[model samples]
Target: ASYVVNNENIDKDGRQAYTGSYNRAALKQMGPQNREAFKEDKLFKAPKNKQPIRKSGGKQYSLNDQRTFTTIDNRTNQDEQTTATLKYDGKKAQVWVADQYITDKQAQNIGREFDERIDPLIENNFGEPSDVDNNGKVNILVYDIKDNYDQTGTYIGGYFHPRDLYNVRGSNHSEIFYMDTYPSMGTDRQHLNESQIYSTLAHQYQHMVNANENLFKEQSQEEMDPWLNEALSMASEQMYLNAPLNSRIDYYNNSKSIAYGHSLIRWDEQGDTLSNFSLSYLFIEYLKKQSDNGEQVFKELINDPGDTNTALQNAIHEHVDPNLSLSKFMTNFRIALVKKENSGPYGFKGDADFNNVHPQPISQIPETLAPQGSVLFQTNQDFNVPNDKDEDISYNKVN
Candidate 1:
């Protein structure tokens, strides 16, 4: 069986049947930190220029990672053509660049990515990169379409679409599509950051293996929970020793950016962009440190035994902490935010290098009755109503 990986798009049936305010499962297919288009996309007009937490969003990665149809779980069947050519050669990955803008060197690196970095990591961490179709090769297709991937410089990093038995709308074969405009050492065209590229690959690779596992096992959370899916992808960003520490600061600052969920657990994104990605990575890092089978435990989180949160909780207990109750883990995780660097369990994970994995220190603020981190108002902003629209403003009238 062949393995196919693709770029990110809100799944067909995945997000198509949006019930309301919760559309995380489908878009988790996107690379880590899927951007907007998740759920409950609420918008608010800050009184004097403040925005609501999402206004809102509850799904997908932040990086563009490209909109793709190369869905692995259902892309194709039995085409083990890894080593490629100017056309469709077979060695590493099979590519069909519509734009023909990619250089040979670029293709070579991308091909090397699977066997070299992504594949090896998958075997070591998760399980063997699935060969479901039995073709024994992974597939990818790259493109330069802006509308397909140009979501706020995300480079639309890219994703994988593997077919689980349940996805009624998914195709049988899996494939991948990537944006061709990533910045690199080259001077002529837009170059992708080398490290970010590989990190993104590792990110998509996780999704690829994950899809196969669930698909073949016939256990898919078509309505997947966003936390576990994204957390592990974020973890992938910093897993390799040689990985680039490119966006950790940006993600760290994102964690602090959420004025909304300050009092909540930092593990889940809670509905902020970079902060969710940052927190997700740290949470997984902490969980991984808790036990030896961290990666296996992580892979098992895909099944939503009941709800998203419970699934994660169950996975945690089943793998990481069989003894400590989840409530304690939650409380300690929060406290770990304020713990001094390299100090205790709440601090950095054992192997965590100080450079990119620090949590936001909860500020020591003066006590208030309203709420410790609540968004307090000045209590004197245009409270008086104009006589112009009394009927529109009030449901009940007073003398």
Candidate 2:
């Protein structure tokens, strides 16, 4: 018999109360203490320590060890494996696959789909990926990996360094290096599929594009904040999203789970990375909705530099709405989560374009959340109401 799927089971299907066993609605209003381990369970993992040495004679290309997985300056060993080249929409993607996962036809399809989306995503939302090395064309690599630094069944999905945005591309000269398979998705990562692979690629690739446009503005190894960077990287997966497993939407629902003190979540921690990811995703989405350019917030955030939190406020003041304050931004988005019935003017601007998550029904939101669902505003505070730092939650300032 199939194992009963629950918090303890294999999660054969994604979880319903993904954060816990509580009702999804109730939990979202307040939930996820274990850092939403389920979400982190399958995405990806890094080597245990930020060791300065990996393989002898290899070079280090990042600003620091934390920015990349290998001291060798790339995603994987640059082995002379059989490779196939794919070109589409005037963009080129070099492809490879492990026999353990994808085959010839499967590789071709994935490559084709990647190019199809690349040009449009770049053209519509941001600039083309920088040919940082002036290599004449963008490069891509799809390959395989073994496991993570320690051992909790951790397997890497795909990796593109922030250096892919600034310091280095993979040692192989490819900005993107993808594992040929998804975690345990018999239905999705099932290997010979499109969504997971491309979604991964899109995320990694966006890092490069985002990095170049921002940090490259100055000739330094300056990196975007991980919280914002990862949020945009994940956001990249959806800029030109198509019909499929539609897993990218999980970030949306996950946002609700991690909303508690989301404004206060720290990004540099070694653990709780997924929880950081959830809040980052939520906040970026909120900024995008207010900005004239929904996804361009990534480009602006990094381009105009400051502390991650300040950069966010500056970006919002510039691209989003000049009148919006950091506090109102958070509160407004917190309200949007519960009022998703309107993926419109009152909802996240992009939510209507694709199916993210429906969430369990809530007959009514909390009473404290009166008028715009913001206890902060209803009580006597308002996102500093248009020009500075002020909020209703006891100087909430992301408290």
Candidate 3:
């Protein structure tokens, strides 16, 4: 019975203050210009560069790959091997690079192994090869950046820029790049093991696949979509952790505390209830199961994200169960979580209290909505006044 309001106003002190104060008339006047700017600034900027492709590729190789470098400087045409002793200890280390390309097949082999282990998860969560490409052909390219991953850098892993997803022409094509930097993997103490590599790849692949699917389907592609995209990605990470190929179960088990905890905090900060998290992942998974029809839903959500209410309503009615209301959907989602947490063997029979009071219902008929300038006022007839000592102080009297 709590009324959860979405798109509420906050005071300067960050307190929840008002509902329905949006200046629709002014917002409408801003119109296409604001929309275009929003898309260009937030949604369509350059994708994060995981591994930047430098003109000289060898210098950009990650720390693990940098150790094997034979040459030091290419511009001076110096073949002399620089005697710079690089530390092998698990800390952030940098190396001088003289070559441009990652000529080492071993590095490529590592990338391939990482990709092979994670791509299946992406396909499962987002969609299969048919869902990725219109022609049903799947091609994925994994590139290694030079002088990229060190044990010290802040970045863990990211997708490459100028890739298909962000490229104006190649946006339709699907590809992703990942890096092995500090706190991620590749330190002397903790070498870049298969499990660590696969987890990182899985996490990034989830992003790539989700980005593509959302773009293709026209979901809310904004960085600030109310749904927890990052948490969903983390959920994909959870799935990878449990996969049969995961060799480093110890690593995953240890990291789960931080990973899951951070995800929960982020979910809460985004004003997303637990049901929102469940619904996002479940809805995405459900779409994956439907193949073609799911693809259509994806497109509908993408092209007209502003019409999410209509799109979701239509999708649920036509493709999913017709009886699925947002409230009922969230209620079932929370129940599923409880079932999952209980290990699925023991059933917990508790009263369902899930609600969907947020996101004020969209009017199916837009024209019938109240005028923008309509106002309501409260009467002060019943209000009482306390006459205090300061009441005698007055300004602008008869004089």
Per-candidate count of clashing residue pairs (backbone under 3 Å)? 59, 1, 20
lDDT of each: 0.40, 0.44, 0.32
Which one is best on lDDT? 2
Worst 10 residues of 3 by lDDT: 34-43
Residue lDDT tens for model 2, 1-399: 000011111111221222212121221222323311233312222222222222222132211122222312123434233343332212455454443455556656666766687646654565456553443445444444433423453234555543332332333333444433545222233444545455666666666666566544555435555556677765665565643223334543444423222222334244445545555555556566767866666666666656556777787687766787665665555545545434442357645643354333232222221111122111112223222212222222221
TM-score of each: 0.57, 0.58, 0.38
lDDT of 2 at 282: 54
Top candidate by TM-score: 2
Off by over 4 Å in 1: 1-92, 128-134, 145-154, 162-172, 177-180, 183-196, 218-224, 241-246, 254-256, 262-272, 292-311, 318-320, 340-345, 349-352, 355-399
| Tens-place lDDT digits, model 1, residues 89-109 | 345445444334566566556
Tens digits of per-residue lDDT, candidate 3, 14-53, equal 2221233222221110111211111000012234542322
**Prediction 3 global C-alpha lDDT:** 0.32
lDDT of 3 at 136: 28
Candidate 2 least-lDDT 10 residues = 1-10
